[PDB]
């Protein structure tokens, strides 16, 4: 992900 | 080329157009017993024979005229067969369809290069009207005078005798394949004649001398289904007999090429810098404002009420330009990613003299490699003789396709490939957790050699620097000591980390493969590349992430660099990494400024360049002078 | 190009592939105090320096080997810095991915011309299996041995030390864009490795010397969305560490081009003639059989139980060929029109060594210009220096688009344009009621000049012939006297017909425009064209129809011509039109045979050529030697 | 169209 750079991620998003 | 046949039994009336070669066939209906012919022409007609001549199909007669007649049938030609006589009454008209074929600014094929011909069309992708939210090419009317500055001018000049169009007609048309990517307005005010609905129009021309003006606009950029060439044809038809259908007598055409979308590298001068104002993003914004003021450029800050808590300005859009011998204007390419900033490029970027373009599935499924932080462009380069005066496009991919691999969307790939002026180059960037080529490569200006320097991340360089620091008696220095609320790491415990060493070795192998790709694809040497110290670490899915802020992910504004602050070990009162970067870059004339982005961007796996976008001056080189 | 870095602190093991240049970087981790270096190489390694040398980035070291090692780390290289010592252990392997790049018959870019390189792929469009009704490329298995004769052979040769692939792996892959238009079978029997489902495969190779064979087939012809190039890549990856991901160490590629679909003109020797057997079609079939027997070719007659009362063999399909350095085979192109004969090209034409292809909307809306009687091809021609050794494609269109105009389908147009070997030419043929270019133009062979003659219908010639007949005292001869149950017309009443004269004048204007188009587009002269007498008449929708059987719509088999019988006026016991055609054509060495088709084809607005199809021998010229 | 050469025609087909 929402505020993270990753478009999708099991952990950060 | 037109053929006219003369029969001695009755004279024929023919219409000739100035500038076109007219062949006169005399043996088609010549008397059988005849063996020689003679030609008697009016002084206004020039005959060429290729004083009698043998009557054989080998010989040819060609007719030319120098002045358009003022009356029908003004000039007569007499063919004397050996003696029978045949007559040919003939009138001359001038029909011209002129465009800017010389690409100089002032008014049937298109060729590249400085010695070519062909006109250039601009897509009307801006918003010159302030009472609408759509682009200028979405309607079939012109509402502003300034809107006529983005349209190519085409002039139809007719010099015909009085009462000439009571029996002839002029038609302006375009093919059904290209009819949905062009629109023509006749200047009287501007009324549409040709477009995505009407593929033909019946022009109304008065006798005598007449000039008509048409404004042409394009509705689509070149793509995989559109080479980029549009042909507009004018046809002169005979309509002497009402019952008989109209017969085509003359045809002329004009070929336009749609100007492609062109990127700009980091070596071009900056003009405007974009940034986002999220919560606690104050010191970073202050540093960006200071850097922009030093570089003499303006700033555009998106308020948090429009950010929707999105701070990644670089990924959402990419700014390029489109130019033509009469007009140049920037264009914004909207990424298929739509996160928070999905409305900024359409509501606060596109406007007067600022076009908009987008591709990809707006609501479909995409990957993290579609963000425009993965799309970059190199400075102009000469590769084994071949010239790229605008540079080459670089984007990331994987080594080979598989189940877990990612890629940039095929729609974007064919769009960038259709823009032929910069041939895209595929780089291996899927090994990264985010997968953005901006995380390991950058370009900076330099006043020597080819005129630029390519900076690449190098774990080896950082390990060597730490080795020298430990050898010089500094082995207890604390990395991450400048920042707080985090674990500070000594040099010895970061040198004796076998897992970190193996991860960095794998990352170095990937970066070396990328460097070997780049050297071959850009014609570089070992003196054109500078290795910036860096440290990576493998993470979830065994993908690399920056150990400390990525120093190569920086903002470049002419000779001013905003570098993420690595917060490395402090020796003799100065950070060793900062000192090394300064020693590497300052001899090139650049000035290094370090910006703190630890708790605002680095924690969210981003850096200074990831959260900023820069508009750069268009190339002086004219794209139509390139030979792809 | 591969970069190897040597550090004096620890030796490194690197893998080099024979035939690839390996650059050895020594200044990346050289001692700071060092100033000169020396190289000590094993006799199996050749070093090139571009006896000490200065230690600067300008100097370069390149390594080469001549034999693949039999053990890992066989060859050592010693770098002596001035003295510290660094070691480099190194093993050599040979990895080759060979195809028929020379286009000669026996086993990373594709270039046209006789001095180019690149392999050619054949579409597996035939039906070599007798227990199926689909094409060979619709399944992922090979069921016949002969099916391996339509597939290109690619050989992977590996010379590696024993126990080499316990730490390295080989991957064969293709891009996701081209993965749906190719299939690869590994020969062991034939098992699929790459195709429209799997874009990558993990090859299993044993140590030592090994050769593997792959058979490649294509699933799609070149189109507007497919340039025709397919790249197959082999990647050597290191898999030394289990936790660390595999890293790419070597990459090689092979580029194939899909062979286009090529037409054959009337100047090529015939091989097979197709015809239909409808009711009362007996004398026409007898004449066709006699002509085929004289021309030494076979016949294929479709029974009425399969005709469904459709006798237009020419319009339903068009026969061309596809060739490659190993195999050539004919292909049938199925017209989007589906009337009666919609099942013949798929059930009685396509078979062993006979491919099938189709385009357009099968159940959608089309026009009468989509019938393949509107599609023809010219003999090889030189146009202003440019060469067309296979000819040019000709099809009919209108002068300009409008509401009532017709056109060939855009899908067919882009298909023919994608087949680049013969650039299509648009001709004005919409003025006809049917709209088929075969109704007014034809090509015949001739042993002089360019080697062919273009025959064009000419109402003027027929009117001149009738004028001479009336001048010679024969003005009461009855046209249509040979046939019965019809109105016979005297010469004077056919000469004094003002409406017929105006209709023929309009038709002559259209044909003259077409001739002027053809001369420019094929580089012809007035000596390359022969005018066949003809008469047209305007009809419903003011469109032209033949007044008497179209004599230019004939069947050409080498030097034998089957011409529709005009049933013209009889003078001195012979038909004047037949005598004129014989006098025009026989000096070229051709033999004219007249076939009666009045009540069977002409009544239904068709002629001898409209109801027949001919298969012609492929060109001797190799298409890959053409430079489009 | 049915037995005519014309693909479509108000009169012959
Ligand atoms: Ca508008
Ligand atoms: Ca505008
Ligand atoms: Ca967006
Ligand atoms: Ca404007
Ligand atoms: Ca970018
Ligand atoms: Ca098969
Ligand atoms: Ca087959
Ligand atoms: Ca069909
Ligand atoms: Ca076969
Ligand atoms: Ca044909």
In chain C, where are the structural domains located? 2-93, 99-258, 270-625
Least Cα separation, residue C560 to chain B (angstroms):
27
State the pairing for strand pair B84-98/B12-17.
parallel
Q: CA-CA distance, B354 to B183, in Å (whole number)?
A: 20
Token pair belonging to C448 = 């002089």
**In which order are the strands placed within the sheet that holds C22-25?**
C2-5, C22-25, C61-65, C45-49
Question: What is the DSSP track for B302-314?
Answer: E-HHHHSS---HH
Least Cα separation, residue B188 to chain A (angstroms):
53
Q: CA-CA distance, C43 to C410, in Å (whole number)?
A: 66
Q: Three-state SS for B615?
A: strand
B302, B312, B488, C560 from B555: Cα distances, Å? 18, 14, 27, 79
DSSP element (H, E) containing C584: helix C576-585
Q: CA-CA distance, C412 to C357, in Å (whole number)?
A: 11
CB within 8 Å of chain B, chain C residues 375-394: none
Q: CA-CA distance, C626 to C628, in Å (whole number)?
A: 6
CA B129, B133, B135, B141 torsion: positive or negative? negative
- Count CA atoms within 13 Å of residue B592 on its CB side: 18
Find which of B4, B17, B247, B413 to mutate to test the C interface (most C CBs within 10 Å of its CB). B247
Token pair belonging to B453 = 């320097």
Q: Please, is B198 exposed, middle or buried when counting C-beta atoms within 10 Å of its C-beta (0-12, 13-18, 19+)?
A: middle
Chain D residues in contact with C370 by the CB 8 A cut-off are: 7
Tell me chain D's radius of gyration from C-alpha atoms: 5
The residues, ordered by sequence, that sit 6+ positions from C423 with a Cβ below 8 Å of its Cβ are C388, C392, C393, C417, C628
Whose tokens are 């003021």? That residue is B293
CA of B271 to the centre of ligand 4 (A): 19
B124 labeled binding residue: yes
Q: CA-CA distance, B401 to B410, in Å (whole number)?
A: 13
Among C466, C472, C507, C464, which residue's Cα sits nearest to residue C489? C466
Indicate the CATH number for domain B2-94. Answer: 2.60.40.1860
Token pair belonging to B557 = 């504004």
Angle, alpha carbons C551-C553-C556 (nearest 5°): 105
Chain B residues in contact with A8 by the CB 8 A cut-off are: 368
B404 noted as active-site residue: no
Check if the beta carbon of residue B516 is closer than 8 Å to that of residue B454: no
Angle, alpha carbons B140-B143-B147 (nearest 5°): 90
In this structure, the dihedral spanned by the alpha carbons of residues B480, B484, B490 and B495, taken in order and rounded to 10 degrees, is -40
Chain C residues in contact with D3 by the CB 8 A cut-off are: 309-311, 604
Least Cα separation, residue D9 to chain C (angstroms):
9
Among C330, C280, C288, C7, which residue's Cα sits nearest to residue B501? C7
D4 reaches C (C-beta below 8 A)? yes
Of B310, B368, B604, the CB nearest to A8: B368
Q: CA-CA distance, C405 to B235, in Å (whole number)?
A: 15
Q: CA-CA distance, B202 to B216, in Å (whole number)?
A: 17
**Strand partners for B272:** B298, B615
**Strand partners for C489:** C479
- Inter-chain residue contact B506 with C399, CB threshold 8 Å: no
The residues, ordered by sequence, that sit 6+ positions from B216 with a Cβ below 8 Å of its Cβ are B121, B151, B152, B153, B154, B182, B183, B184, B232, B256
B124, B211, B328, B464, C110 from B151: Cα distances, Å? 8, 18, 12, 59, 40
- Inter-chain residue contact C604 with D11, CB threshold 8 Å: no
**Strand partners for B23:** B3, B62
Least Cα separation, residue D3 to chain C (angstroms):
6
Check if the beta carbon of residue C444 is closer than 8 Å to that of residue C561: yes
The class of domain C2-93 in CATH terms is: mainly beta
Q: CA-CA distance, C488 to C468, in Å (whole number)?
A: 20
State the pairing for strand pair B2-5/B22-25.
parallel
Token pair belonging to B118 = 């062909």
Indicate the CATH number for domain B270-625. Answer: 3.75.10.10
Annotated active-site residue in B74, B438, B531, B597? B438
- Inter-chain residue contact C29 with B510, CB threshold 8 Å: no
Chain B residues in contact with C5 by the CB 8 A cut-off are: 460
Phi, psi of C74 (to 5 degrees): -65, -40
Check if the beta carbon of residue C372 is closer than 8 Å to that of residue C402: no
Q: Strands (DSSP E) along B70-167, which ranges? A: 75-81, 84-98, 119-121, 152-160
CA C194, C200, C205, C211 torsion: positive or negative? positive
Check if the beta carbon of residue B394 is closer than 8 Å to that of residue B424: yes
* B270-625 matches B2-94 in CATH topology: no
Among C70, C266, C252, C256, which residue's Cα sits nearest to residue C181? C256
Phi, psi of C535 (to 5 degrees): -140, 130
Least Cα separation, residue C531 to chain D (angstroms):
25
Q: Strands (DSSP E) along B188-269, which ranges? A: 191-194, 200-203, 208-218, 229-238, 247-258
Among B175, B122, B176, B168, which residue's Cα sits nearest to residue B148? B122
Phi, psi of C162 (to 5 degrees): -65, 145
Token pair belonging to C472 = 């010679």
Among C482, C429, C448, C457, which residue's Cα sits nearest to residue C554? C457
What length does chain C have? 628
Chain C residues in contact with D2 by the CB 8 A cut-off are: 309
Among C508, C527, C507, which residue's Cα sits nearest to residue C519? C527
- Count CA atoms within 13 Å of residue C366 on its CB side: 23
Q: CA-CA distance, B335 to B358, in Å (whole number)?
A: 7
Phi, psi of C39 (to 5 degrees): -120, 130
Per the annotation, where are the binding residues of C? 124, 126, 128, 136, 139, 141, 147, 150, 314, 316, 318, 334-335, 338-339, 353, 372, 375-376, 604
Among B116, B114, B132, which residue's Cα sits nearest to residue B124? B132
CA of C308 to the centre of ligand 8 (A): 13
Active-site annotation of C, residues:
315, 436, 438, 610
Q: CA-CA distance, B265 to C560, in Å (whole number)?
A: 68
Check if the beta carbon of residue B541 is closer than 8 Å to that of residue B549: no
Q: Which ligand is nearest to the CA of C137?
A: 6
What 8-state DSSP symbol labels residue C618? P
| Residue of chain A with shortest Cα separation from B278 | A3
Among C321, C333, C322, which residue's Cα sits nearest to residue C359? C333
Which CATH topology does B99-258 take? Immunoglobulin-like (2.60.40)
- Inter-chain residue contact C248 with B502, CB threshold 8 Å: no
**Strand partners for C40:** C78
Among C330, C335, C400, C324, which residue's Cα sits nearest to residue C122? C324
Q: Three-state SS for C493?
A: helix
Q: CA-CA distance, C345 to C358, in Å (whole number)?
A: 10
| Residue of chain A with shortest Cα separation from B545 | A6
B440, B579, C206 from B596: Cα distances, Å? 19, 16, 54
Residue C7 neighbours by CB distance under 10 Å: 17
Q: CA-CA distance, B59 to B61, in Å (whole number)?
A: 7
Cα B239–chain centre separation: 44
C145, C288, C381, C606, C618 from C300: Cα distances, Å? 28, 11, 32, 20, 19
- Count CA atoms within 13 Å of residue C212 on its CB side: 22
- Inter-chain residue contact B371 with A2, CB threshold 8 Å: no
Annotated active-site residue in B190, B297, B510, B610? B610
Annotated active-site residue in B100, B315, B397, B531? B315
Token pair belonging to C20 = 């690839």
Q: CA-CA distance, C307 to B191, in Å (whole number)?
A: 54
B20, B188, B205, B208, C313 from B157: Cα distances, Å? 15, 15, 10, 11, 50
Whose tokens are 């090889």? That residue is C380
């Amino acid at each position: 992900x929402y505020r993270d750079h990753h478009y999708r991620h099991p952990k950060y998003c | 080329g037109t053929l006219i046949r003369v029969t001695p039994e009755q004279p024929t009336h023919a219409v000739c157009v100035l500038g076109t070669l007219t062949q006169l066939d005399i043996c088609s209906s010549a008397p059988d017993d005849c063996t020689s012919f003679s030609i008697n022409a009016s002084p206004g007609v020039v005959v060429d024979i290729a004083s009698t001549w043998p009557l054989d199909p080998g010989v040819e007669v060609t007719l030319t005229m120098k002045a358009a007649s003022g009356s029908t049938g003004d000039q007569k030609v007499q063919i004397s067969y050996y003696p029978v006589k045949a007559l040919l009454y003939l009138t001359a008209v001038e029909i011209s369809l002129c465009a800017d074929i010389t690409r100089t600014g002032k008014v049937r094929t298109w060729t590249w290069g400085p010695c070519g011909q062909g006109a250039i069309l601009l897509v009307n992708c801006d918003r010159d009207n302030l009472e609408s939210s759509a682009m200028d090419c979405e309607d079939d009317e012109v509402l502003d005078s300034e809107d006529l500055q983005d349209m190519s001018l085409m002039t139809l000049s007719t010099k015909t005798p009085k009462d000439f169009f009571t029996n002839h007609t002029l038609v302006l048309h375009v093919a059904r394949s290209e009819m949905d990517k062009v629109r023509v307005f006749q200047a009287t005010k501007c009324s549409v004649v040709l477009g995505p609905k009407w593929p033909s129009h019946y022009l109304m021309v008065p006798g005598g001398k007449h000039n008509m003006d048409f404004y042409v606009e394009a509705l689509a950029f070149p793509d995989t289904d559109f080479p980029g060439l549009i042909t507009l044809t004018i046809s002169l038809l005979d309509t002497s007999n009402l019952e008989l259908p109209e017969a085509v007598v003359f045809q002329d055409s004009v070929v336009f090429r749609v100007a492609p979308w062109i990127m700009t590298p980091n070596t071009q001068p900056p003009q405007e810098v974009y940034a986002c104002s999220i919560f606690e993003n104050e010191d970073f914004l202050k540093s960006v404002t200071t850097l922009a003021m030093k570089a003499k450029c303006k700033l555009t800050i998106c308020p948090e009420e429009e950010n929707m808590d999105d701070q990644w300005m670089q990924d959402e859009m990419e700014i390029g330009y489109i130019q033509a011998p009469h007009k140049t204007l920037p264009v914004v390419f909207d990424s298929p990613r739509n996160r928070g900033l999905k409305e900024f490029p359409i509501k606060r970027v596109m406007g007067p003299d600022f076009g908009y373009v987008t591709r990809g599935p707006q609501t479909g499924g995409i990957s993290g490699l579609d963000s425009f932080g993965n799309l970059e462009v190199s400075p102009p380069v000469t590769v084994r003789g071949k010239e790229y005066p605008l540079g080459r496009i670089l984007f990331g991919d994987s080594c080979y396709p598989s189940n877990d691999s990612r890629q940039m969307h095929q729609a974007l790939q064919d769009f960038l490939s259709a823009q032929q002026v910069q041939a895209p180059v595929k780089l291996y960037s899927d090994w990264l957790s985010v997968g953005h080529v901006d995380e390991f490569l950058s370009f900076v200006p330099a006043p020597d050699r080819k005129g630029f320097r390519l900076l690449l991340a190098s774990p080896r360089s950082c390990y060597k620097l730490f080795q020298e620091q430990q050898n010089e008696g500094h082995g207890e220095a604390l990395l991450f000591e400048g920042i707080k609320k985090k674990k500070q790491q000594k040099i010895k415990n970061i040198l004796s980390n076998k897992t970190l060493r193996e991860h960095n070795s794998f990352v170095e192998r990937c970066i070396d493969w990328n460097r070997e790709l780049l050297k071959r694809e850009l014609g570089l040497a070992e003196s054109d590349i500078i290795d910036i110290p860096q440290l990576f670490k493998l993470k979830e899915f065994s993908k690399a992430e920056a150990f400390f802020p990525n120093m190569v992910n920086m903002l470049v504004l002419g000779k001013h660099l905003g570098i993420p602050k690595p917060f490395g070990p402090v020796i003799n009162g100065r950070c060793c990494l900062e000192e090394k970067v300064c020693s590497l870059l300052e001899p090139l004339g650049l000035q290094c400024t370090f910006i703190n982005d630890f708790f605002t961007y680095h924690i969210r796996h981003g850096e200074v360049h990831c959260g900023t976008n820069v508009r750069r001056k268009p190339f002086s080189f004219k794209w139509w002078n390139m030979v792809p």
